[PDB]
Write a protein that binds this ligand. Structure first.
Ligand code: 4LN
Ligand code: CL
Ligand code: NA
Lengths: 234, 55
């Protein structure tokens, strides 16, 4: 996250960080004690992943972290990286042993398809992650967060050479300076509804973090709610 | 006039249109619709989407 602020402990208790060959390479969100939602481009069947919930500063033990092994990876059935690494860019991770829910490890709410879309239409969400804090710069140690406004479809289409399909949205600022970045992929875009946060997007990609005239591109979660609910039901 | 299209029926989370110019509010998993018929109160120890650690 470029242009963000340090989260306080427990401020985004649904955030997770993923570790694999490289530690802290993508984000995710807690759906329930056994399931994480992330981006499909972050994961692949066969490559071993661990999830860390309750994380804040990746370089200090804070006595709230819970590490779990991923036993199943479910990319969305329409995901196909050979066609487009970033379309239908969503996946579910099943944990080996359930998380212990507490004030530092709390699921994100997921509304039905209609309301997830209404909430995205409110036009302002929060993104968070341990990704780069400058384009091609260092990654964060302390979880970063940022409020990003929804960018209207016409503006985002005029800003990129790539086609942005209707199952994606754009968010960010006309002047740049504030954006998600590499390493934040798979993390949450959430909308606060009277003090309760709902998942409205998955952080997916962008061309140049925080560059004026470019925006962050997000997966619309409304398009996948039924699939998430079906697959993660306990 | 009371409908889900107007201020979400004054429902804190979700609204459904019902009979006689009324609405029925509801909440996500882990919350209960409160006695005021609009608000959402926790019904489990760690409901989703809530910050509980002192900020
Ligand atoms: C999550 C995010 C948010 C905002 C960002 O600017 C951002 C970046 C990257 N991730 N990222 C990867 C590296 C970075 C240089 N981007 C990329 O390397 C990049 C390049 C092309 C695509 N793409 C191809 N077809 N559709 C999309 C996607 C990503 C910048
Ligand atoms: Cl109820
Ligand atoms: Na830590």
């Amino acid at each position: 996250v470029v242009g963000g602020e340090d989260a306080k402990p427990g401020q985004f208790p649904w955030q997770v960080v993923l570790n694999g060959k490289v530690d802290a390479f993508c984000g995710g969100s807690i759906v329930n004690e056994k399931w994480i939602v992330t981006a499909a481009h972050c994961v692949e069947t066969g490559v071993k992943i661990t999830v860390v919930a309750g994380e804040h500063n990746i370089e200090e033990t804070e006595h709230t972290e819970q590490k779990r092994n991923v036993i199943r990876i479910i990319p969305h059935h329409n995901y196909n990286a050979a066609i487009n690494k970033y379309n239908h860019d969503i996946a579910l991770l099943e944990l080996d042993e359930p998380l212990v829910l507490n004030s530092y490890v709390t699921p994100i709410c997921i509304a039905d398809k209609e309301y997830t879309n209404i909430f995205l239409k409110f036009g302002s969400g929060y993104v968070s992650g341990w990704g780069r804090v400058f384009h091609k710069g260092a990654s964060a140690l302390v979880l970063q967060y940022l409020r990003v406004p929804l960018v209207d479809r016409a503006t985002c289409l005029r800003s990129t050479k790539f086609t942005i399909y209707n199952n994606m949205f754009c968010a960010g600022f006309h002047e740049g300076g504030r954006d998600s970045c590499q390493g934040d992929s798979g993390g949450p875009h959430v909308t606060e509804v009277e003090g309760t946060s709902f998942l409205t997007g998955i952080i997916s990609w962008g061309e140049e973090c925080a560059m004026k005239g470019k925006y962050g591109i997000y997966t619309k979660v409304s398009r996948y709610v039924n699939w998430i609910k079906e697959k993660t039901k306990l | 006039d009371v409908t889900c299209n107007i201020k979400n029926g004054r429902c804190e989370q979700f609204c459904k249109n019902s009979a006689d110019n009324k609405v029925v509010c509801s909440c996500t998993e882990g919350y209960r619709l409160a006695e005021n018929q609009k608000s959402c109160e926790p019904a489990v120890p760690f409901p989703c989407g809530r910050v509980s650690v002192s900020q």
